[PDB]
Design an enzyme around this catalytic site. Structure first.
Site, PDB file in Angstrom:
ATOM      1  N   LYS A   1      12.226   8.810  12.275  1.00 19.34           N
ATOM      2  CA  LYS A   1      12.600   9.270  10.942  1.00 19.34           C
ATOM      3  C   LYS A   1      13.906  10.050  10.964  1.00 19.34           C
ATOM      4  O   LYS A   1      14.675   9.989   9.999  1.00 19.34           O
ATOM      5  CB  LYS A   1      11.482  10.120  10.342  1.00 19.34           C
ATOM      6  CG  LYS A   1      10.188   9.364  10.112  1.00 19.34           C
ATOM      7  CD  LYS A   1      10.448   8.007   9.485  1.00 19.34           C
ATOM      8  CE  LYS A   1       9.169   7.395   8.951  1.00 19.34           C
ATOM      9  NZ  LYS A   1       9.432   6.452   7.832  1.00 19.34           N
TER      10      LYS A   1
ATOM     11  N   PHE B   1       1.700  13.339   1.403  1.00 18.16           N
ATOM     12  CA  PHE B   1       1.433  12.482   0.263  1.00 18.16           C
ATOM     13  C   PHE B   1       0.049  11.859   0.375  1.00 18.16           C
ATOM     14  O   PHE B   1      -0.500  11.702   1.468  1.00 18.16           O
ATOM     15  CB  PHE B   1       2.499  11.388   0.141  1.00 18.16           C
ATOM     16  CG  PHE B   1       3.596  11.730  -0.815  1.00 18.16           C
ATOM     17  CD1 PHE B   1       4.583  12.631  -0.459  1.00 18.16           C
ATOM     18  CD2 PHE B   1       3.642  11.159  -2.071  1.00 18.16           C
ATOM     19  CE1 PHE B   1       5.590  12.953  -1.338  1.00 18.16           C
ATOM     20  CE2 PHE B   1       4.649  11.478  -2.953  1.00 18.16           C
ATOM     21  CZ  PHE B   1       5.623  12.376  -2.584  1.00 18.16           C
TER      22      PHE B   1
ATOM     23  N   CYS C   1       9.963   1.261   2.659  1.00 20.32           N
ATOM     24  CA  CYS C   1       8.801   2.118   2.826  1.00 20.32           C
ATOM     25  C   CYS C   1       7.934   1.743   4.017  1.00 20.32           C
ATOM     26  O   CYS C   1       7.018   2.502   4.352  1.00 20.32           O
ATOM     27  CB  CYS C   1       7.927   2.106   1.561  1.00 20.32           C
ATOM     28  SG  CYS C   1       8.836   2.179   0.009  1.00 20.32           S
TER      29      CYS C   1
ATOM     30  N   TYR D   1       7.569  10.004  16.118  1.00 20.20           N
ATOM     31  CA  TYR D   1       7.697   9.810  14.677  1.00 20.20           C
ATOM     32  C   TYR D   1       8.944  10.500  14.136  1.00 20.20           C
ATOM     33  O   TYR D   1       9.673   9.937  13.314  1.00 20.20           O
ATOM     34  CB  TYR D   1       6.442  10.323  13.974  1.00 20.20           C
ATOM     35  CG  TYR D   1       6.418  10.076  12.486  1.00 20.20           C
ATOM     36  CD1 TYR D   1       6.109   8.825  11.977  1.00 20.20           C
ATOM     37  CD2 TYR D   1       6.686  11.099  11.591  1.00 20.20           C
ATOM     38  CE1 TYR D   1       6.079   8.597  10.617  1.00 20.20           C
ATOM     39  CE2 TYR D   1       6.659  10.880  10.230  1.00 20.20           C
ATOM     40  CZ  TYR D   1       6.355   9.629   9.751  1.00 20.20           C
ATOM     41  OH  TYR D   1       6.325   9.408   8.394  1.00 20.20           O
TER      42      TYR D   1
ATOM     43  N   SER E   1       0.840  -1.188   0.000  1.00 19.18           N
ATOM     44  CA  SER E   1       0.000   0.000   0.000  1.00 19.18           C
ATOM     45  C   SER E   1       0.878   1.241   0.000  1.00 19.18           C
ATOM     46  O   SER E   1       2.074   1.179   0.294  1.00 19.18           O
ATOM     47  CB  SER E   1      -0.945   0.019   1.205  1.00 19.18           C
ATOM     48  OG  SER E   1      -0.335   0.652   2.315  1.00 19.18           O
TER      49      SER E   1
END
Ligand SMILES: Nc1nc2c(ncn2[C@@H]2O[C@H](COP(=O)(O)OP(=O)(O)OP(=O)(O)O)[C@@H](O)[C@H]2O)c(=O)[nH]1
Ligand SMILES: Nc1ncnc2c1ncn2[C@@H]1O[C@H](CSCC[C@H](N)C(=O)O)[C@@H](O)[C@H]1O
Lengths: 255, 284, 255, 255
Positions: free
Chosen positions: C166, C195, C85, C162, C14
């Site tokens: 990252k 996105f 990803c 998060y 996905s």
RNA sequence: UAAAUAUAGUUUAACCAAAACAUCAGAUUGUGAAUCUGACAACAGAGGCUUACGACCCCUUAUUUACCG
């Protein structure tokens, strides 16, 4: 794709600019080589066919760039891409106590005039020409790609003038991208490392081969064609904007 | 005050009268110096309660409706903080507009021509007009010219905005628009102008007179423009619309929404969407 | 070119991972979707034809990844590209004084387990698989592409966990590129902005329009196909190593 | 000034933490050495006078930090400053083709837990204690100082785990500063490089004496007292917030 | 000159009588904030009448239609 696009490549008679023109023209685009009258761009423009034209202009002067863009508009009818590859460099220490030598202010001003002032001068006048274009299906009017080497981040000894100019291009990439966001123009910056430009091939094999071996991988000087590939990738990607891309093979310059 | 000598049988008389009145409301009652004016005000003062309680009754009726369902009956990227984030985003856009945005002028020199009802209504349209500017993609630089600091219009604006008045991203000033801008670039918009507005000009300052004359007073805006040497323009309502009904003088919130659409490259077909459909039978 | 290459795409059922697989398979490469068993990876792999297979695995488990890499070797014989990803997002304030609520440690650990720890677990294992490859004409053995986020540079309120996960990916991209340079494996990182992944598209239309308007240009959410385009460009360009590329349309997230 | 402030120094039994406690106590502040039971922090607390106390706690353990913070509340009443200096390191490489050696997963997990998760564990628990303080004349309730490393930017070979955890601290220093902004807590990050700590003495002396010459200026190892001076500077400056300060003597770490 | 009309955020409804959608201020919202607490609610305008009303009657401005044995 880039087929049918019109690109104005400053400093396109040699080095990174010429490699960008060969790839873009080879991919079906049209290129306007903007360079100095003595750079020999006319010979390069003839080799690239009828889709490439040479416009002799000095990027430091507003008059020459205006006439050059008038020639680009005359020959192809529109401007879609601006690639700022024009640049010079000076290797001089800021101050040498053992020699009592000080960096010359004319040398510092000269590098800024071509690398920093010339880049902005092209950008501000080119943005007027892309402003006349009708937005495409994505609302984009043009793409501007600047060149500002890794010296902007980790400059070497005696590169103060060159790092100051390239640091300026990196610093102003985002404000200009925000300036032209209502218009639809994308501004992107590439930070090439050590590339096989006629500048690097000029210096002796000792420093040439050593620096090529200093790149982690690939352990060689950057192919200017690889610079052209990344230039085309930026043009084809609608979502790349206001970002500096290092193209150096992961090398961090030691003092 | 003896003014109770009218209300205390006007309720029993059978006319519509509110039950809760204050001295402040009672004071404004005695400025109404005629039977019809007092009746008209009392009718307005009565209907204030009528929709208040009706909406009041609605809201705690909802409270019981939700409290029974609320009490009986994961991976996220953003905290639900959007109203705060939207206000900040509009603030950054408004700060940029105050530096590089196109100036738009609301002329506040109409205080002497307005009754209390009209003056209050002007603020309501002003609140909505400035609200639409904030939410726009390319906001104007809104100017409040000829706004007297102690004047009635200023006090009403302060009362409505409360704390927000000092924080608005607009330039309110005592000076006239002619003092702030060259007299050549000023175009006083007015419905009585003999010159029809053809295209939106981005190098011009458009002046909208913040005048709501429910007792219509034609030529007031034109007189001010011709008292100075300002140029005037009128919307091409006749050119693009088949008018049938109502006054051709639009409200301040409609005018700013038409200008905003034109500034964003919209054509007259999209711009005149904001003219009330009750006044015409389609664009031609 | 990417024709004939084998790509292992973590979280490829996905979002960005699926878009990368669709482009690479379309361009002529083979893909292995490495995702959780409960995801619709089996349906997605079937939809992409015989050149794409689904390898169920949890990136946080060493045993699961090794079985997935064995499956890629069995079906296709070699591994050429790894795209990381896979990742989760958690929004939680570090401490809320009015509410008396303190950020839960288990929330921090799980985000770090999948995003940071999971990314490195794939990297260390897939690097050994590319270490068995014979170098091509350029001396390269493979390309490893990690997916950081713009939160690694400007994290918003509630993105403490998060951003840390990252930010670590941005931290490791150069040291790992230095580790694998002798081997001939390039390591690169992409930092997407806003996105059109299912995470963002599930939000109410009211806030979806606002997020689209926050991007300077183009004023829309990033197309997952645009992420796939930049992944291909990194693979084809041999001189991109140890660099973080922001693909966000020049957006700088506000607090 | 820092006189009267109560500082909780994480990992304050040696190296940067001990130097920070040494300076702050000398300037008139109160210190709490939050370190491991076997670190020898009780001797350090006694040597620093009655203004310093030792709190044996593991930063990875929520229970241990809460008891340690409660000890500071009992001994001093309030918590004003938190300095996160505890950290471990690993020198394993990501993958070694010649020896067929892969970076073991537990080494990456163990470094991440102490450095990244441990720092956040202290930050969120000390945020509750700092949230009880009365805002001062400037509205400030406390200051949180984190210790990243230069490896977060230009980490060397075999520093993938260390760069990941240090990159995470750099990544989350801004969201936490944004999270704690309404409370009135400043979050700042220091990125030291090559300091004269026990960490820079475990490595071989010839290597260590070589790194001292690698620093452009001062051409030596960083004095931990210099780190302590910068911590005091960050405390006394109300406008330092959300920034990473490199304290390395202008060194850029080679591969 | 006459008749029709005239909603000052927009529509609908109308002797139903108030809606629905909007607007302004406050909100650190745990993902129904799809909410809460407040601000503003004048059917062109000014007067007459009437126990009253938006009805009825003059007047003013305006809009659309027509306009000489
Ligand atoms: N039949 C007809 N008569 C019209 C028309 N327009 C104007 N008139 C006549 O012209 C008159 C003009 O009235 P006023 O506007 O009061 O006349 P004025 O002479 O301008 O006087 P002031 O208003 O005091 O300036 C009308 O009352 C009609 O007698 C029209 O379209 N048809
Ligand atoms: N049709 C139109 N064309 C241009 N401006 C208009 C307009 N209708 C209203 N406006 C503007 O909106 C404002 C309120 S309308 C009130 C105008 C004034 N009472 C008069 O009788 O002349 C005015 O300042 C006018 O400039």
């Amino acid at each position: 794709s880039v087929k049918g696009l019109v690109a104005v490549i400053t400093g396109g008679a040699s080095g990174l600019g010429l490699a960008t023109a060969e790839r873009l023209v080879g991919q079906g685009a049209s290129a306007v080589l903007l360079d100095l009258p003595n750079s020999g761009g006319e010979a390069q423009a003839k080799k690239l066919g009828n889709n490439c034209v040479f416009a002799p202009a000095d990027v430091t002067s507003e008059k020459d760039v205006q006439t050059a863009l008038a020639l680009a508009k005359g020959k192809f009818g529109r401007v879609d891409v601006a690639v700022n590859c024009a640049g010079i460099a000076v290797a001089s220490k800021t101050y040498n106590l053992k020699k009592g030598q000080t960096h010359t202010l004319e040398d510092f001003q000269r590098v800024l005039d071509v690398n920093l002032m010339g880049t902005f001068n092209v950008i501000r006048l080119v943005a007027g020409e892309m402003g006349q274009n009708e937005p495409d299906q994505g609302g984009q009017r043009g793409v501007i790609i600047n060149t500002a080497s890794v010296a902007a981040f980790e400059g070497q000894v005696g590169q103060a003038a060159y790092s100051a100019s390239k640091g300026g291009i990196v610093g102003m990439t985002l404000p200009i991208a925000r300036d032209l966001a209502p218009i639809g123009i994308r501004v992107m910056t590439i930070a090439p490392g050590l590339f096989g430009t006629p500048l690097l091939t000029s210096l002796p094999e000792k420093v040439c081969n050593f620096l090529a071996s200093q790149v982690p991988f690939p352990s060689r000087l950057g192919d200017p064609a690889e610079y052209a590939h990344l230039v085309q990738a930026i043009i084809e990607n609608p979502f790349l904007n206001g970002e500096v891309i290092r193209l150096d093979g992961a090398i961090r310059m030691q003092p | 005050a003896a003014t109770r000598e009218f209300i205390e049988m006007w309720r029993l008389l059978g006319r519509e009268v509110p039950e809760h009145i204050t001295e402040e409301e009672l004071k404004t009652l005695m400025e109404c110096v005629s039977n019809t004016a007092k009746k008209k005000y009392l009718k307005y003062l009565y209907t204030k309660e009528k929709v208040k309680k009706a909406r009041q009754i609605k809201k705690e009726m909802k409270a019981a409706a939700r409290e029974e369902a609320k009490n009986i009956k994961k991976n996220f990227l953003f905290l639900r903080l959007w109203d705060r984030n939207m206000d900040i985003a509009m603030g950054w856009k408004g700060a940029q507009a105050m530096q590089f945005g196109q100036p738009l002028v609301f002329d506040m020199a109409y205080e002497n021509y307005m009754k209390r009802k009209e003056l209050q209504n002007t603020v309501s349209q002003l609140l909505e007009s400035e609200g639409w500017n904030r939410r726009n993609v390319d906001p104007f630089h809104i100017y409040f010219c000829n706004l007297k600091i102690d004047g009635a219009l200023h006090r009403e604006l302060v009362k409505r905005y409360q704390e927000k008045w000092d924080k608005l991203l607009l330039t309110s000033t005592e000076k006239s628009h002619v003092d702030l801008f060259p007299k050549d670039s000023i175009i006083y918009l007015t419905a009585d102008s003999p010159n029809v507005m053809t295209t939106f000009r981005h190098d011009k300052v458009y002046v909208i007179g913040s005048f709501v004359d429910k007792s219509m007073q034609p030529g007031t805006s034109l007189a001010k423009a011709k008292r100075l040497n300002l140029a005037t323009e009128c919307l091409p309502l006749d050119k693009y619309l088949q008018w049938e009904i109502g006054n051709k003088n639009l409200t301040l919130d409609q005018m700013i929404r038409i200008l905003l659409c034109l500034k964003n490259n919209g054509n007259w077909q999209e711009a005149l969407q904001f003219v009330p459909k009750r006044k015409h039978t389609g664009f031609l």
